[PDB]
Amino acid sequence: EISKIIRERIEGYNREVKVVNTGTVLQVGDGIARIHGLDEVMAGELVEFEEGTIGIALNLESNNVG
């Protein structure tokens, strides 16, 4: 059984990472990034990065987004 401290701790980590319209970069190589998250991004949506680069979402895989 998970205690009350450990339940609110994991949701503390989980609440932060799972933002609604945001993502996290997993890989970058030679013109393509794989993004963790972006759960509500749609096929073909423009996707803006933190340095400022713009991307287009093509592969909406079940784990990540190409």
Partner: protein
């Protein structure tokens, strides 16, 4: 079967077998399965984005409350280091099948329209240890109404070998009258 989920579970059982904690380890593995059912708990461990360092600290706290076996705590730590926490659920389920093999036990499934008594279960266990060679036999019951009256058991290494007499009489009589 030999897939990565199966491969890891087999290792976990082998170390328990060596150290004679097969009963002790099995309880802990059953205890883990309750832990990782929760969508929120499983998601936290599984996703790549959450930092690995944070995962260990949380994992250690979880282990302490749980009071898991010393190897079992390692085994999860090994999974986390080697990235295979995305397939924990497959691994945990796989261990049960391996654990029966080591004991020499066998599992059986018997199903009925209405609940039944213990002596019937013991005699089905007798027959399954006869035709199977369980060192020991094991049994499970699932009440399903859409049959007529019978019992169906299900056994083997996988959930494969099936004998029954409820509706197989009726479907058999359709397929025997077409003859």
């Amino acid at each position: 079967v030999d897939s990565t989920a199966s491969r890891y579970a087999s290792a976990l059982a082998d170390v328990a077998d060596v150290t004679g904690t097969l009963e002790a380890t099995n309880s802990d593995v059953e205890k883990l399965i309750r832990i990782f059912s929760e969508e929120p708990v499983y998601y936290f461990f599984a996703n790549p984005v959450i930092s690995i360092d944070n995962k260990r600290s949380v994992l250690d706290e979880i282990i302490t409350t749980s009071g898991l076996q010393p190897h079992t705590a390692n085994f999860i730590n090994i999974l986390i280091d080697s990235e295979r926490i995305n397939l924990v659920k497959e691994i945990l389920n796989e261990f049960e099948d391996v654990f029966n093999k080591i004991t020499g036990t066998e599992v059986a499934v018997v199903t009925s329209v209405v609940k039944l008594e213990n002596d019937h279960l013991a005699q089905i266990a007798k027959g399954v240890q006869k035709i199977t060679g369980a060192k020991n036999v094991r049994i499970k019951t699932v009440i399903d109404p859409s049959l007529v009256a019978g019992f169906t058991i299900r056994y083997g290494n996988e959930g494969s070998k099936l004998v029954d007499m409820s509706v197989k009489k009726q479907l058999e009589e359709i397929a025997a009258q077409l003859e």
